[model samples]
Target: GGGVTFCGGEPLLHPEFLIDILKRCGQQGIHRAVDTTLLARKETVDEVMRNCELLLIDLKSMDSTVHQTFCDVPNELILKNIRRVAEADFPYYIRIPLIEGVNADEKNIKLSAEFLASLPRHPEIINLLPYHDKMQTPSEEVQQQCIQILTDYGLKATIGG
Candidate 1:
């Protein structure tokens, strides 16, 4: 069956509306996927997990300070929510925006791989999305290296969305 994905503008912000739509999709046997930052209240996350079939979680940076620097918010809640999803054995994917001068470095990529490998239930795939802004993208060499690091940790990684 086909599916619908809810994303952008923080879909989790309107949890009730999202859950209602997800339930409707379920009734029609339509798979539901949510692309989110997972930075919502615990109850909101729980409800969304129960209603959706797949989660596309964005993980910007594992370092809290760096995360705050870029996203203007701490990453503790997001990381915690990811752990919860893994512990529940839910089907999900981790998406990372690979920015060369930011988080696409060897250290960050390795740490990310290690963290994912340590999860109770690993992500279905780690998506290393090349950062794009007008005319720039992360280097191909860096993307390949990131994939290699993840593979070393026994995690599946791919470049692109």
Candidate 2:
């Protein structure tokens, strides 16, 4: 079978549309997944969860202040929404962006480790993705350090895709 992965500026912003598309995918037996920030209302999250089999969520940072500066929106609700997704009983991976000078520090990675430890059920995988656009490839040492943090928290971890 084929698969569809929904990823965007914020795909869940159009929950009903994605849900409808997911429904069609289901009918056709096409595998489905969504890549998002996991910042949305309960209704939207629930709808998307019900229709998709996998979630690829970017947990930019666990520190609310850092998260706010990095992503215009505060992360408290994003954390709450992540808790919802964690308990949704589907396959998911927490993808962390390794920013060269910002969040790649040990302190922030430890905060992320703490958050993952606090979850009821850990995600199947934790991926440390290097910040990428046109000019950056994460340093290898920091990537290993980030993976070590997650592993220290007792979760499976990997660097990049």
Against the true structure, whose TM-score is highest?
1
Error of 2 at 37 (Å): 2.0
Residue-level error in angstroms, candidate 1, position 41 = 2.2
Can you give the lDDT of residue 6 in candidate 1? 87
Report the alpha-carbon TM-score of model 1 versus the true structure. Answer: 0.92
What's the lDDT for all of these models? 0.84, 0.79
Q: Using lDDT as the measure, which candidate wins?
A: 1
- Sliding window of 10 residues with minimal summed lDDT for model 1: 133-142
Q: lDDT of candidate 1 vs native?
A: 0.84
Model 2, position 65: C-alpha lDDT score: 81
lDDT by residue for model 2 over 1-161, one digit each (tens)? 65999985556677777889999998999989887565467777777778888877788876778778877878887677778887776677888878876678888889888887788878888888888762266688778878888888898988876
